[PDB]
Amino acid sequence: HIKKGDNVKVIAGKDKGKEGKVIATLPKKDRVVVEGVNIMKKHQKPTQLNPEGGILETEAAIHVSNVQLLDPKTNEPTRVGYKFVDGKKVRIAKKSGEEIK
RNA sequence: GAGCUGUAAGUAAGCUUUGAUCCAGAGAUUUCCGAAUGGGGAAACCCAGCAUGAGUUAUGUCAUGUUAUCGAUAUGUGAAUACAUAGCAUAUCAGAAGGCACACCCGGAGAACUGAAACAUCUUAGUACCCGGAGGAAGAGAAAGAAAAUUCGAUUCCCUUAGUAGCGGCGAGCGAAACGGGAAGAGCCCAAACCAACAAGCUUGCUUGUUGGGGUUGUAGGACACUCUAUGAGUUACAAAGGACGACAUUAGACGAAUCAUCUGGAAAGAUGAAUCAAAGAAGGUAAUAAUCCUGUAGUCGAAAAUGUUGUCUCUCUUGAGUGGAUCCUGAGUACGACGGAGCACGUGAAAUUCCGUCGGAAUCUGGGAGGACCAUCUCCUAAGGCUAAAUACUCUCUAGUGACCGAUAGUGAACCAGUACCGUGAGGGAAAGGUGAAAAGCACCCCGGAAGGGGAGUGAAAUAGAACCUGAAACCGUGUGCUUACAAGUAGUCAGAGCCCGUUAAUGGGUGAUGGCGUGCCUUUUGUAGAAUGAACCGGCGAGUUACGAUUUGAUGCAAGGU
RNA sequence: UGAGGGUAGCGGAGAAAUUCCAAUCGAACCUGGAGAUAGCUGGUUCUCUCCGAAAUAGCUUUAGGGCUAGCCUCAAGUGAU
RNA sequence: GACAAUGGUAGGAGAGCGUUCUAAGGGCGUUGAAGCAUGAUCGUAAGGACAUGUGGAGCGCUUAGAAGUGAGAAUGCCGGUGUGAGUAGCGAAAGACGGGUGAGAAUCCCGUCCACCGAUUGACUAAGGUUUCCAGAGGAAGGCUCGUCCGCUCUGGGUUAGUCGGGUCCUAAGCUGAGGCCGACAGGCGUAGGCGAUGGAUAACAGGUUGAUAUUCCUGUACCACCUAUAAUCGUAUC
RNA sequence: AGACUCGGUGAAAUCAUAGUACCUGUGAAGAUGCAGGUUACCCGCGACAGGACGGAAAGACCCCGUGGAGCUUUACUGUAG
Numbered sequence A: 001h002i003k004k005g006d007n008v009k010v011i012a013g014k015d016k017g018k019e020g021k022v023i024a025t026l027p028k029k030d031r032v033v034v035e036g037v038n039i040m041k042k043h044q045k046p047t048q049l050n051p052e053g054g055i056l057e058t059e060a061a062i063h064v065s066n067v068q069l070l071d072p073k074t075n076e077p078t079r080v081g082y083k084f085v086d087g088k089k090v091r092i093a094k095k096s097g098e099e100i101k
Numbered sequence B: 001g002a003g004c005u006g007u008a009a010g011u012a013a014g015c016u017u018u019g020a021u022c023c024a025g026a027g028a029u030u031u032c033c034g035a036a037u038g039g040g041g042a043a044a045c046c047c048a049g050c051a052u053g054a055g056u057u058a059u060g061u062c063a064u065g066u067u068a069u070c071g072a073u074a075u076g077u078g079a080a081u082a083c084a085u086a087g088c089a090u091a092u093c094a095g096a097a098g099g100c101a102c103a104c105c106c107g108g109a110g111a112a113c114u115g116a117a118a119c120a121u122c123u124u125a126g127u128a129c130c131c132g133g134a135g136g137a138a139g140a141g142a143a144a145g146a147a148a149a150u151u152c153g154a155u156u157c158c159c160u161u162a163g164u165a166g167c168g169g170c171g172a173g174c175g176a177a178a179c180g181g182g183a184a185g186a187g188c189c190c191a192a193a194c195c196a197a198c199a200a201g202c203u204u205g206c207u208u209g210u211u212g213g214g215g216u217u218g219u220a221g222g223a224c225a226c227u228c229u230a231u232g233a234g235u236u237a238c239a240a241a242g243g244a245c246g247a248c249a250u251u252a253g254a255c256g257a258a259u260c261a262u263c264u265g266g267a268a269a270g271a272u273g274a275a276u277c278a279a280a281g282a283a284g285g286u287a288a289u290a291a292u293c294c295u296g297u298a299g300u301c302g303a304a305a306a307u308g309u310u311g312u313c314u315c316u317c318u319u320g321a322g323u324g325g326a327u328c329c330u331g332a333g334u335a336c337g338a339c340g341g342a343g344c345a346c347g348u349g350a351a352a353u354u355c356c357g358u359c360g361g362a363a364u365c366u367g368g369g370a371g372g373a374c375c376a377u378c379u380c381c382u383a384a385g386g387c388u389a390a391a392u393a394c395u396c397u398c399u400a401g402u403g404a405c406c407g408a409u410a411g412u413g414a415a416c417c418a419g420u421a422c423c424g425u426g427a428g429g430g431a432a433a434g435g436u437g438a439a440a441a442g443c444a445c446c447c448c449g450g451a452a453g454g455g456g457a458g459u460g461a462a463a464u465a466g467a468a469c470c471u472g473a474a475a476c477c478g479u480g481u482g483c484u485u486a487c488a489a490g491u492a493g494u495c496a497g498a499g500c501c502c503g504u505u506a507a508u509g510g511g512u513g514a515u516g517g518c519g520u521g522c523c524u525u526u527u528g529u530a531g532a533a534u535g536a537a538c539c540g541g542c543g544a545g546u547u548a549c550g551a552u553u554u555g556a557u558g559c560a561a562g563g564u
Numbered sequence C: 001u002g003a004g005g006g007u008a009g010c011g012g013a014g015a016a017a018u019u020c021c022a023a024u025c026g027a028a029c030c031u032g033g034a035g036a037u038a039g040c041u042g043g044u045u046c047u048c049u050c051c052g053a054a055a056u057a058g059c060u061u062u063a064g065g066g067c068u069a070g071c072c073u074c075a076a077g078u079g080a081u
Numbered sequence D: 001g002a003c004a005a006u007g008g009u010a011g012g013a014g015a016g017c018g019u020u021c022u023a024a025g026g027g028c029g030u031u032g033a034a035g036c037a038u039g040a041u042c043g044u045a046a047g048g049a050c051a052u053g054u055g056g057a058g059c060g061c062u063u064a065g066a067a068g069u070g071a072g073a074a075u076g077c078c079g080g081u082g083u084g085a086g087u088a089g090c091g092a093a094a095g096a097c098g099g100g101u102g103a104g105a106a107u108c109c110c111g112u113c114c115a116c117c118g119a120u121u122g123a124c125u126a127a128g129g130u131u132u133c134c135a136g137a138g139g140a141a142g143g144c145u146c147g148u149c150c151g152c153u154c155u156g157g158g159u160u161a162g163u164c165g166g167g168u169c170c171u172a173a174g175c176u177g178a179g180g181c182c183g184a185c186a187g188g189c190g191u192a193g194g195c196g197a198u199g200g201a202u203a204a205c206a207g208g209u210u211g212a213u214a215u216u217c218c219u220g221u222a223c224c225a226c227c228u229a230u231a232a233u234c235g236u237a238u239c
Numbered sequence E: 001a002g003a004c005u006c007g008g009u010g011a012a013a014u015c016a017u018a019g020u021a022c023c024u025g026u027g028a029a030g031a032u033g034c035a036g037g038u039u040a041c042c043c044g045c046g047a048c049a050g051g052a053c054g055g056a057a058a059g060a061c062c063c064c065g066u067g068g069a070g071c072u073u074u075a076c077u078g079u080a081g
C-alpha cells in the first residue's frame, strides 16, 4: 500500500497537513516512519561513546492508516488500485487515473 | 513482491530486484532409547559373531552389511526301529506382535453399599471395574415369520399403542409386542441328487479320494424326460477379479464501490455543515464512537502439482423359460424329551417359542415345524451352512460460524512456557500467577548517599500512570487539631439538657456533652437463655428449594358436541 | 550386625501382646462405583400489609419419626342452621 | 363523612424495591461515563437522586421478557490485617587483647597468650547426596543478632589409569526361561541355556608437585597379556 | 544456667463489642454486667494462683440409632472341602 520513496500526506495526527517521505516501514505492526512527523526528544544515555550530555531527536513511527498517498493533479491525496496487462501489477490512483511510481 | 536473521529486545558479522524472508504440494536427511528384534540391562547404556572396506611391516581400533521368537510353504537329513515318523540344518516371507480417541458397538467373565423404612428370594444391575476382538461404524437380516382379511411379504431406528396385557415375600418395584403413521428400502451364494477326468477296484457303482460342469425353493423346487431360445445382459460394496482421457470438490492466492472543510482536544471516527457508494450498513484495528483511512465483506476469479469423489470409455465375465410324471435328492448324533442352570417384560408357574452341560435319541413330501401346557381338523411356513449397502450410535481431532454462555476466588486443574514449582519410597495428590502509555519518547545533567531510596530539572494529555507501574474500598498502624476527661461502679446507647467552637442541599440547622431518668449484646435450640448452654478475632469476596418428562388443581385464552 | 534376595490385604509374618507390615492396623494406602446412605446435628440471603395455630386422640419393629382425625389459612357454594 | 378494625412465633394469602442480560422506542458522554469518597436531601419500608473532589470510556430512564437474582453466623472455604507483646525464645560448650581492613567491627583476616577432645571433636575409604570443591568481585534475600564474612548471589576455572574399585572371566540365595505341562481370558509353574557379588580368580611401587586432581601428571627402577622381526634351532618336537 | 534492667532480632495458643469492684439477695434453681446497699483518685512494673462454670480434644463413661465393625455358639439361611 505504502512503501519507501513516495510522498505521503498525514490526514489524522498532531502533525497533520504535512507532506514528506517514507523512511522505513515496520511491516508487522503496520507502522511507517516519515521524516519531520512525530519527532521525539530521547533522553539518551550520555555515557555512550558518541555524544557529550544531550538529547536525541529521531522521528517516531506512525500507523499506516494515517498517511495517504497523493497525486496532486487535482490537489488531492487519493487511494490506490491495481491494473496489470504486463505480468506485474502497476499501481493506479483511482481518483485520477494516472500511473504512479 | 522488499525487507529478513523463532522468542529479538541488544550489538556483531551478513544475505536479497540474477526475486531473498514467508506460505502450500511433492521428494531427500531422520543420531541413540523404545513391540526392541544379535546376546545382556537398573530405558536413553555396556559386550559380540561371520562377510566386504580403510588403516598399520603387522595385531589393537573404526565404517557400511546383516543375524530374535513363534507359523508354512518349501529343500535337505541320521533318527530310538530295517522302511519311516516326532528331532535337526538352511533359503525365503510388506504374514504376526505394540500404540491407541479413557467416545460409541459386539462377545467372555461380573460386585457392593443402596431401595424394600430391619432382611435372605428381589431391586440397585447384567451396571462399575477387568479381559479379548475389531470397525469407520458395529450388531440383526432375506421368514420352519407376524396373523385370523377378498391377509401382507427381510432387518434396523423415531412417533403411537402404554405405564394398558402382564410378571411380583402379588410387597417394593420390573414392563412388553403385533396392528397403524413414517426415515430408509437390493437380495443372493454353497451342500445333496448328479454328468466328465485322473491316482486305488474284473470293483456292481460317473456314487468314494481330489478337482471342474450342474443346481437353490413352498404357488413344491430341483436330478432325470421333452422343445425354444443361444450377443442381449456387465459391476470390482453382497453376487469372480487387473487401466486411460477431463468434469467437479479440498490443501496456497488475486481483484473488490464511495468524505471533504471547520469547533472543543494531547489526538476526530464526535456534535454542527455540506457529499456519495450500496448484490457490499457482518466483524476487528487505527491517538475517543468510521458505510467511504486500513485489513476486509456481497460478488466474481485461480492450480505446477499430490490425493478424493463420481459420469462413459475400455476391459473382464455370463443362458433364458415351460410342460411332464415313474425313479433319486432336498444339511444327524441333528430336532426333541427327563435331571440341573441361564435367557426371553415373565421370579418353575398350567409355561409356549430360544441357547448351554450331561446321558438317552428321530421321521424323509401321504414328510417336518408353529399359531403361549397339551390333542383333533382348517391356516401360514420350510429348522439343523454362509456372505450383504443405506436409514442409526459417536468426536481426540482439521475449516467456516453462531450464543438473552463466563469475564481473572469466574470459565478448563491451566489466559502467566501447567499436570509445572511442591508433597509421596510407590500408585497417586496439586495450587499459585493477568493490565505503564496512543507511542518507550523507561527519568540526560546537578545535588545528600558506600549503595538503596529520594528532590529538583526534563519526556508525557496526566508520573498525585516510574516496571512495589489502570481505578484503589474496608479492617489495621500513623501524624496533626475545635469540644472534652485525673472522687468515679459504665451491654457503652437513648430521651431531657446548660456551657463552648462553627456555618449547610436553608430547615423551626451541624459538631462536642458537665448533670438527671429509664436500660442485663446478636443468632441457634427450648416448657424457659444476660445466661456460667452452641457458634463467630476482625474486614472483604465466594457460599443453599434448581431444571427436565409426567400428575393434579387454580388463573388466562381460542374454539365449543366437538377440541387437538 | 552389613550386602543381595523371597512371602502382600478374603492376604503375609508372629518364643503369641490383637504384636508388626513406610510416624495409622479387632483388618494398610491410592484412584474408581459415589454427589453411597442418614427418621440425627449445624446452615438457609429483600421489604411492608391482613388473618394466625399446636404440644391432644387412634394405630404403628411404635415411643425425639409417620399417616388419617382435631385446631389455623385462601377461594367457591347453601344461605340463619 | 359517617361508624369500624390494625401485638403476634410455625404457617396460608396479597402487594412492592433492587441487581446482571436481551428485544423495541427515546436520551445523556472527553465542554467528561462507570466505579470510589464526603454531605445537613427525598419516599409508608426495601431504596431514588442531586452538589463539589478523585477517575479516564462507556452507561441510565418508560413497557415487556428471562434468571448462576439479594449474606451476620454453616467449629463454612481462599486472601488480607490485628490482639496476645515489644512478651516467650535465640538450639549443651572459654574466651582475652595488640594490629591492620572498612562508609560502618565484641563477630571477618594475621599475630601472641589461654582453655577443650585425644578408643577421638584426629587421619583414609564404602552407602548416600550431585558442584558444595577452588580464585577473583558482591551485601537485597537466606544465617535465630551483627557482618567487610560464608556451604548464599554474579563471572571464570576444577575430576588424566594396560597394573587401584568394577565391565570384556566364574558361580551362590533369588530372578527369567526355547520346546513342554496346567488355567473363563489375563496368565501361574518348569527342563537345557542365560542373568546375579556381599565371595573365588586377577600383572606397581617409592619420592616430587598445583590456587583446586594424584599408585591417574613426571622423575628413577619394574612387571603381565599380545604382535613383529629373529639367531643357537629341534623335528612322530609341539596345540 | 533461665528469670530481673539495658543493646539486637522477635513468635504462639486465644478472642461477640468492653470504661471489666465487693456483700446479701433474685434468676435455666452456682452473677464483673439485674435490684438494694457499702467501699473505690488516673496510668505502669516485679510476684502469687481463688474466680472468669479459664485454654487444648462435636464426653472417654451411660442411654439412643429398626448406625457400623470384630469375635462366638446346639440362632436362621447358605458354601469351600
Ligand SMILES: [Mg+2]
Pocket: none
Ligand atoms: Mg459388556
Ligand SMILES: [Mg+2]
Pocket: none
Ligand atoms: Mg461472662
